Design a protein around this nucleic acid. Structure first.
Lengths: 116, 211, 119, 54, 122
RNA sequence: GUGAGGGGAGUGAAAUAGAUCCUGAAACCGCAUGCAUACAAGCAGUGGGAGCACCUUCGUGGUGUGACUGCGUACCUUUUG
RNA sequence: GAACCCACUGUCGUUGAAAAGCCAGGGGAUGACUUGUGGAUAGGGGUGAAAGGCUAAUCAAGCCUGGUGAUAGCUGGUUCU
RNA sequence: UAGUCGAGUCGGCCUGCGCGGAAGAUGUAACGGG
RNA sequence: CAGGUCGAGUAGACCAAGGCGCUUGAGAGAACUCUGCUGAAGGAACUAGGCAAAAUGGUACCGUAACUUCGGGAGAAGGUA
RNA sequence: UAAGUUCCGACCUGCACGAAUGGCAUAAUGAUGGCGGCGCUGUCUCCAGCAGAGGCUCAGUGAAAUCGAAAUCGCUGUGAA
RNA sequence: GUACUCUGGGGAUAACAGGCUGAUACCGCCCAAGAGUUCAUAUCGACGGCGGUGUUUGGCACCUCGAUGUCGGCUCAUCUCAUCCUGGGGCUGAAGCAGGUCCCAAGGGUAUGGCUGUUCGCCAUUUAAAGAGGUACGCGAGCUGGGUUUAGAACGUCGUGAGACAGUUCGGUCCCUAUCUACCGUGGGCGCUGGAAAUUUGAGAGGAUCUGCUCCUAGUACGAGAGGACCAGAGUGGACGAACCUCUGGUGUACCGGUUGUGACGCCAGUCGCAUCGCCGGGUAGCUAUGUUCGGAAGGGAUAACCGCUGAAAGCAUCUAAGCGGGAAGCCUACCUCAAGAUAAGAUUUCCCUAGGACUUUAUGUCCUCUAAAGAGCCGUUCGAGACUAGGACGUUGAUAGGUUGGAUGUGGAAGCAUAGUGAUAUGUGAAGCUGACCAAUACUAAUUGCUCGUGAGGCUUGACU
C-alpha cells in the first residue's frame, strides 16, 4: 500500500498518541471487552518480542506466562480495541526479534534493564 | 445496468468504531464520458458506450479521432459498452459524464476484471490433482496425470478431459461485494473484499444482478 | 513465475556470477571501452555505476567499502582520483551500451560498453 | 513408439511449410552512407555521429 | 489445529493426564478441530484411583491450541500447549476444577461452567 | 584465403571424353512451365463429364489438367472360411 | 577406524559414461588376510568351504576344422503367354 | 311391489386387426434414412 | 616419494612446491523430470514393511539392569563440564 | 490396541514332532526371519517457496528402432465373431 | 524325471480376455394351501406355471501361440438404474412421532482407521448417506510388485531313486526419445463482394446444481399419559469451487548481522575467498495456504407419478373421447465463461483512395509512366503477458527500462577517533552504518537517421425510391 491514494486513505485513520516502546520493554495493554451491553477494560501484561512498523499496518507481539502456561498475542497497533499502552520497564537486548525466549524457563528468561 | 469502469489501486484495511478490521480494495475512477447511445431503431438493442482515461494524439488513429470528435469528448485509454433499459436510459445524452455518485454506501455490487497470468500449469495446480507417493519405489511419476482413459472400449480420450495447460489471465466476475466508501472529492470507491486482477488493471463495477 | 523479479542467472552459481561481474567492472574501469555479450553488458550497469556514485566522495570508509567490493587497489585509486571527479556533476548515466552485431563462434549477440567521456 | 507407416513426401513438405527464413532490418546510416543493421554500430565503429575508435 | 493421532493435555481434575484424538466430529471428511469443537479421545495416562481409567473412550472439548485463534480486529492468540476438557455422554463437563487459562469462545450455555471455574479468561 | 571450386582462352573427331574421367538405367532429391486445390470424410482407381492452357489440317481433331457425379474395404501365403 | 579387499539397502542408467556402472549409506581390515612375477592341472576331462559354480563377454558337457550339402512324415518359397 | 319416464336392451360362444405384460450401461441406435 | 596450520592420524577443511579449468556454445528462467535446502499445526494417521528421509555422533568425570560358558552383557541405559 | 488373520504366554485330538538324515535348551555373535516401544522426522493430512542440471529459443554437428501403400474423424450396426 | 532344459511345428489343440448358448445365476410376472388378525389380497407366502438379462458357475473351441503379456493397490475417470441420502406421491395394524409396501425421480453427494498381499470379511469410531452394476472382471508404451509362476534353500507328505505337491517357509532384474487417430493448450495461412480502426447482436458450447444443526411458529395440532406436528420464517456450520495477499504465517542462495577453521590483501586495524548459502539469528518485494473474501441464488415455462373441474359414449356413474387445471433436487430458461470458419461468414460509428498514355484476345483485358493514402509490420526500451508465439505500454511532441535524488522498509549501534579498564571488553560521537524486487520525482544513459507491405472510387441482373 505505497500508492499515494492508499497512503491518504490510511493516514486518515492514524492514531496520534502512541508511546515509544521497543522489543525489550515490558508493557501493559488495556483491551476493551464488551460482554452483553456492558463494556470493561482488561489488562494484558508481558514482554514485547517483535514489532512491525508498517504505518496503519503496524503490530507488536506480547508474551506472558499465565498460571504456568505461555500465551502470546499479536496486537494491531491502531485498532480501536487497544485502548492504552503503558511502558513499565525498558530492557536491553541485542536483536530485533526475541523468539529464543520461547525455549527458556523462568530464571533463564530474564531480560536486563536498560539504564539511562 | 449502468456501471463504471475504473482501475484497481490496491488493498488496505478499514477500522470500524467497534474495532472490527474490514479488508477493502480501492478503485480509482476517472469520470466516464458518454460517446454513443445505441437504440432499437438503428442498432437493434439499447446500450450506452463510454470512454475513460487519456491517450496522446500520436497513439490515436484517424478513425477514432473522428469518432471522439463526433462524440464531443476527449479520447480515452479504453472504450466499453453497458447494456441498459429504457428507464435508466433517461437523462443520459452523448457528451455527458457518469461518476462515483452513481453508487451509494451499503449497496451490493459485482466487480469484473482480468485474473493474473500463471502461464503453463499442470494438473496439481490447474485441477487439484492428487500426487503419487514420493517413496516406496516410485520411479518418475510424482506429479504426472496418470491414467487418461478406458481400454479398447471406447478406445479414445473424451472431450473435456482435464489436462495440463494455460491457467489464469481470463475474465472473472465476483458477486456480492458491499460498497464501503464513496469519496466524491477523490473520485474513489472502496469495496469490502478482494477483486480480480493485478494492481493497475482495469475493472468494471455494476449493480448486483442477484437481488 | 518471476513476477516483479530482478537479476540474472546466466547458467552460473551465485558466487561465480558475483566474481564474473566484479572482474568485468575492474576491466571496464581500467580500459574505458570493452566488448562483451549484450545481456552481460546490460547487467553490468547496476554493478558499475553505484561504484562511481560511491567514489564521488573520498573518505576512509568509502575507500574501504570500494576495496571490499572490488579487491583491486589500482581500481580503487583510479575510482577516487579520476572517475569520481570527472562525473562529480552528472546525475547517473555514466555508461553507454551499444549493440555491435553477432559473434562468429556461437552467433551470440554482442555489445560495446564505454564510459561517457572517455577522451 | 514409432510409426506404423512411412510418411509421404507430400506430408513431409507440408510439415516443412513453416521453415522459410526472413530478412533482417537494414538501413542506411546518414553519417557515412554505408548500409548497416538498424540500431547497431557500423562495422567501422560509427553510430549516431560518433566514432568509438581512433 | 487438532487431527487424528494428536496428543492433548488435560486441563481439568477428572483424572486423565494425556489423551489422543481419534475422530473429529461435526461432519463428513472434517479435517481439523479448533477451540470450542467436540472431539473423540482415548485416555492414555490416568492418575491412580481416579474415575477415568486407562483405555476409556470419552468425549472432550478443545480449550487451548498452539495454532491459535483469530479475533475480529485481526489479532491472533496462541498457546504453548494443546489442552482439552473431558465431557460425559451428554457433552457436559464432568470435572470440578479447571486448570490453566481459557478463551472467550467457550462463552456458551454448554460450557458456562468451564468459563466460571477457569482462573483467567482472555 | 597463392585453398577448394568454377568462368573464359587453348588441345582434341568428341571436354555433361577434364583425370573414381567409355555408355550413365532405377530407387531418392532439386529448379522451371500449364492445369487443379483452403465447406469437405475412407485401397486413391474406374465409367461418365464442364471449364482452362498449348498445337492446330482449326475438326465430330491432338497434347496436358480434371470442378461435379454412379460404382468400388491392396497383394501373397494358409484355410471350412 | 583410513589405505587395500568385498558387495547388504535405496536412487539414477536400461538405443547407458559403462555388453554389469555412478552416487549416498554398508562389511572385513594380523588373518581360514590381500597381492606381483613364473609355473602345474584339458572336455565325459580338469578344478570346486558345493551354486551344476568356473574352465578367455560362450557351459546339464569349451572352441576350431573335418564326416557334411547330417536327417527333418515339419514351416516357407518356387519366375513368360 | 308400483309408477309419473318411453323401445330397444341383458348375458354368452366362434372369428379379423389392435392394447397392457416390456429394465442396462458410448450417442437417437428394435422401418437403412427422410 | 609425499611439506604447512589444526589434528591421534597417510582421516578431515584450507594452502606450499607442482599441475590444471578437463574440445560445442549463447539466451530464456513454462508444465514435467533429476539433485539439494527450508517449512505453519499434527507426528507413522503412509505403506506389504518407518522403504526413503529425519535423528545420534568428540574428550574428561560420574553412573550403569536381567542374564552369563565369569571372559562378557557394557560406549548398556543415563547425566555433568 | 479404541479396533490384533501377525506376535507373546497357556491348552493338546500331533490331518502329517521325536532323539547323531540327532531331541530339548542355551551366554556371546548375525548388512538373518517375526512383533512392540522412545526420540525423530515432508512417509503422510497436503503440499508451498527457493538453488543447481535438463526441458524451451538461437548458431554448428547430427543417430535410433519401424515402415505394402495412404486424400490416416465420431456413433450405431455388420462382418474370420 | 527334467523348475537346469533344447529344436521343428499348431490357435488343426488347452490356461486369460472376446464370441455363440443360457443348464446354473439374478430379476420380473401368473395362481392362491396357509400365517398374521381368533377381524383386512396391510405384509409374507406352499405346490405349480410363464418370461427378461447377460452381472455368477458352466457348455462349445469361432479369433489371436513368426506373443492380444500380469491378481490386488495407487492416480484418473465415463455410463446404467434394478435409488443409499437428498426431492414428489398412493395404500397401510397410517391418533402423533416413526415405520412397512408400491409408483415417479440419475441434478448433486455418497467415511477415517486396526488385522490380513488380498478383492472380500470381522472389528472401533463417524456421516444425511457410507447403493448395485458395465466399461479387455475400466485404467501397468501412467506408477508399484505385496500374492501368484524360473533358477537357491528348509519342514511336512509321496516315491527305491532322479524328483513331485488337495501343502508350508526365508530370498529373488518391470525396456521403449510418440509417426497417425484421440485429447489439453497456443500460433501461421486464406476466406468473409474496395480497404482500414474500434465497439458489438447471439444460432450454439461449456461450467455450477450438495447438505447438517439451532431458534420461531408451539409444549401448538394430535394424543389416557408418555410423546409431539404439517406448513412457514431467521441464523449458523461441514465439504466443494473461485479469486486475492489488507491481516496471520511459510519461503525468500543478489538484504543486514553473530560466529569456527584456514589462506590471502607488506604488518596492526579493517576486509575478502573456500568449507552444503561453512554454520547460526532475523528479513523487503514476489509466489503461496494452513490466511482473507465470495458462490451454489431466488424466479419463470412445460411436465413425470399423483390429484382434479365440467362431460358423453352408456338417461346413472365416470380426471376424457370434446374443453380446461394443479403438480418434483428431473427438462428448457434463469447465474458465470466462450462464441459470426454461424462459408448462414451478421450489426453499428468513424476514417482513406476519384492520374495519364499505348495495344488487341474487346474486357472488373493487358503493358509503360506517374502516384502509393488510411493503416499494418520490421526494429528498439519493456511488462504484474509469456515455452516460442500471441497479448499490453512506450520510442524525444518521451517517464518505456536502467541509473540518480528523496521517502519507506529490514538489520540493530559501521569505520575512525576519544574515554574507562592490567585485559577480555564497555561507553560517546549516533538508532549510526548498510540496505534486491517497493513508492514519488528527474532526460543523466538507451528507445537515431529509417525501411517494407498495404493503392488510385470498387463487376453484372432485377426491383424501390431518387
Amino acid at each position: 500500500g505505497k500508492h499515494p491514494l492508499v497512503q491518504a486513505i490510511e493516514n486518515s485513520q492514524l492514531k496520534t498518541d502512541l508511546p515509544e516502546f521497543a522489543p525489550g520493554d515490558t508493557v501493559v495493554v488495556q483491551v476493551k471487552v464488551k460482554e452483553g451491553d456492558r463494556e470493561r477494560l482488561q489488562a494484558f501484561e508481558g514482554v514485547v518480542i517483535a514489532k512491525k512498523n508498517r504505518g496503519l499496518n503496524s503490530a507488536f507481539t506480547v508474551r506472558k506466562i499465565s498460571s504456568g502456561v505461555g500465551v502470546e498475542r499479536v496486537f494491531q497497533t491502531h485498532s480501536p480495541v487497544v485502548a492504552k499502552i503503558e511502558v513499565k520497564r525498558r530492557g536491553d537486548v541485542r536483536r530485533a526479534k526475541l523468539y529464543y525466549l520461547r525455549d527458556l524457563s523462568g530464571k533463564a528468561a530474564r531480560i536486563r534493564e536498560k539504564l539511562p | 445496468a449502468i456501471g463504471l469502469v475504473g482501475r484497481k489501486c490496491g488493498m488496505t484495511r478499514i477500522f470500524t468504531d467497534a474495532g472490527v478490521s474490514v479488508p477493502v480494495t480501492v478503485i480509482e475512477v476517472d469520470p466516464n464520458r458518454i460517446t454513443q447511445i445505441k437504440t432499437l431503431e438503428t442498432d437493434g438493442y439499447q446500450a450506452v458506450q463510454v470512454t475513460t482515461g487519456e491517450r496522446r494524439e500520436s497513439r490515436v488513429t484517424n478513425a477514432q479521432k473522428g469518432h471522439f470528435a463526433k462524440a464531443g469528448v476527449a479520447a480515452g485509454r479504453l472504450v466499453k459498452e453497458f447494456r441498459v433499459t429504457e428507464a435508466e436510459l433517461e437523462g443520459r445524452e452523448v457528451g455527458g459524464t457518469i461518476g462515483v455518485d452513481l453508487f451509494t454506501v451499503g449497496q451490493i455490487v459485482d466487480v469484473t476484471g482480468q485474473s493474473k497470468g500463471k502461464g503453463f500449469q499442470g494438473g496439481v495446480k490447474r485441477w487439484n490433482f492428487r500426487t503419487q507417493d514420493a517413496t516406496h519405489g516410485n520411479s518418475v511419476s510424482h506429479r504426472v496425470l496418470g491414467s487418461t482413459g478406458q481400454n479398447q472400449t471406447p478406445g479414445r480420450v473424451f472431450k473435456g478431459k482435464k489436462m495440463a495447460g494455460h491457467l489464469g489471465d481470463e475474465r472473472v466476475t465476483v458477486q456480492g461485494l458491499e460498497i464501503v466508501s464513496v469519496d466524491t472529492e477523490r473520485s474513489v470507491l472502496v469495496v469490502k473484499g478482494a477483486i480480480p486482477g493485478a494492481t493497475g488493471g482495469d475493472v468494471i463495477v455494476r449493480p448486483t444482478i442477484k437481488a | 513465475m518471476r513476477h516483479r523479479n530482478s537479476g540474472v542467472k546466466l547458467g552460473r552459481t551465485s558466487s561465480h556470477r558475483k566474481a564474473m561481474f566484479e572482474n568485468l567492472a575492474n576491466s571496464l574501469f581500467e580500459h574505458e571501452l570493452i566488448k562483451t555479450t549484450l545481456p552481460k553488458a546490460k547487467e553490468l550497469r547496476r554493478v558499475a555505476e553505484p561504484l562511481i556514485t560511491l567514489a564521488k566522495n573520498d573518505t576512509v570508509a568509502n575507500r574501504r567499502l570500494a576495496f571490499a567490493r572490488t579487491r583491486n587497489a589500482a581500481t580503487v585509486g583510479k575510482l577516487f582520483t579520476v572517475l569520481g571527479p570527472r562525473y562529480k556533476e552528472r546525475n547517473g548515466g555514466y555508461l553507454r551500451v551499444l549493440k555491435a552485431g553477432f559473434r562468429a563462434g556461437d552467433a551470440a549477440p554482442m555489445a560495446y560498453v564505454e564510459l561517457v567521456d572517455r577522451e | 513408439a514409432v510409426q506404423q507407416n512411412r510418411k509421404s513426401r507430400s506430408r513431409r513438405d507440408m510439415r516443412r511449410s513453416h521453415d522459410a527464413l526472413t530478412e533482417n532490418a537494414l538501413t542506411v546510416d546518414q553519417a557515412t552512407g554505408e548500409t548497416h543493421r538498424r540500431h547497431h554500430v557500423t562495422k567501422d565503429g560509427f553510430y549516431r555521429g560518433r566514432q568509438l575508435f581512433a | 489445529m487438532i487431527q487424528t493421532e494428536t496428543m492433548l493435555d488435560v486441563a481439568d481434575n477428572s483424572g486423565a493426564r494425556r489423551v489422543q484424538c481419534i475422530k473429529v466430529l461435526g461432519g463428513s471428511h472434517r479435517r481439523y478441530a479448533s477451540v470450542g469443537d467436540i472431539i473423540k479421545v482415548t485416555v492414555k495416562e490416568a492418575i491412580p484411583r481416579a474415575r477415568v481409567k486407562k483405555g476409556d473412550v470419552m468425549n472432550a472439548v478443545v480449550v487451548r491450541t498452539k495454532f491459535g485463534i483469530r479475533r475480529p480486529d485481526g489479532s491472533v492468540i496462541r498457546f504453548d500447549d494443546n489442552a482439552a476438557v473431558i465431557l460425559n455422554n451428554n457433552k457436559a463437563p464432568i470435572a470440578t476444577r479447571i486448570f490453566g487459562p481459557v478463551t472467550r469462545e467457550l462463552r456458551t450455555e454448554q460450557f458456562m461452567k468451564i468459563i466460571s471455574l477457569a482462573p483467567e479468561v482472555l
